[PDB]
Design a protein around this ligand. Sequence first.
Ligand code: CL
Ligand code: CL
Ligand code: CL
Ligand code: NA
Length: 468
Amino acid sequence: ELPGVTEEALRLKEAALEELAAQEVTAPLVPLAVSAFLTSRKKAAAAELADWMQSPEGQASSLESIGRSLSRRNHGRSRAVVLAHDHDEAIKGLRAVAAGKQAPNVFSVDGPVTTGPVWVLAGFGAQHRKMGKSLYLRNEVFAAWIEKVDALVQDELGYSVLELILDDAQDYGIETTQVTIFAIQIALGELLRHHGAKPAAVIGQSLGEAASAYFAGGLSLRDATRAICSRSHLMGEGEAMLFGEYIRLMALVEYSADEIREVFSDFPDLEVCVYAAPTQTVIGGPPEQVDAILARAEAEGKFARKFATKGASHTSQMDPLLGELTAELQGIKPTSPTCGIFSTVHEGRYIKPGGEPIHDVEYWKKGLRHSVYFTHGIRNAVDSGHTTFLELAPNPVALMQVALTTADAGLHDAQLIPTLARKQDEVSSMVSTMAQLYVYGHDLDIRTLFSRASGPQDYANIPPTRFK
Ligand SMILES: [Cl-]
Ligand SMILES: [Cl-]
Ligand SMILES: [Cl-]
Ligand code: NA
């Protein structure tokens, strides 16, 4: 059978749980949903809830019991959610809902978003030391999926990703960044499905393509894990041996594809790694030429930033890895997708649900070797009516690129929903994520955001759980 959690992971987990229990308890973020067929009725419901919450009876009721009772109402066309830690934040946010005013912890819209969400599976440049650790310790569904991928990666590569997540002294390299972000992406998406969410379409970027294939139903979890494991360890081993004239850097520069065609005439060995946004592109090549194009960009007032790597993925430098990558992926079973795919490997084109499989061995070779057409995939999604983009990531780096494409396409009110972020509480982040899916009308059973009631004190004395 599959390997179990290692002894060292269990040791690290015990230590982390002791440290966690020694901290001060912070008040959880509670989602308070109010809805009605008409926005005017929703605003009135918000004002009445706020009035009652200021009464002594409302003050004596926990936010969690108020939220659990609200979660059982009929969820109408016009929706709103207040995210609060205490009664004061709740009443303040509800006043904003009632008065139609905007607030950071308030989401309120007049009706549903017409098209389903695009799940964005990226990850390049998003890793950070403690990513996923807090949610692993505090959410049992997320933890179960982390442990499933951990067991598969143990089987494929012979080490435990969970050990990396739990060990604060450990940081991530070329190889371990990929398998660990993959593990976190799988577990974040399955946590969302557990609460009723589903992608209408997926779009992958760079290392995130393996997770996109799983959530699109194009590969089983085992085969998606083979894809990320085969490429990551070949890339990590190759990058570690690069010195001198063999080094190729990667850098984000504020140049469009049109500008790069002209700019590259001075730098004969530069290649495009990722078309990230309409005016931003990840490029790769020899250090002297990468240094020169960065210096040109800064002289023109344009942004430029290097990544921490001695090798350039999505360039001709990957050629020597493709033969072994072919051999390691023999036997994977591409399947017909169960949702739409905006394939950034295949230049941003759309593959319909039920379409022919795309995730064969040649797809992973092409994805590693050639450019990532990310902005074109996003633009294809915007032009087809999609407005909600949800990024599964330890840090919402790709969502900021998506915002540049959506605004460039004329969509200035897109629903850009992050998941985890460095220096933000990972439990509260997933509450905000799921509350946002709810307010926009996407599939999400808001009842599942609250544990099952054990007694009458777990409800508040308001509709629909009034105590006769
Ligand atoms: Cl009911
Ligand atoms: Cl109701
Ligand atoms: Cl429960
Ligand atoms: Na461009």
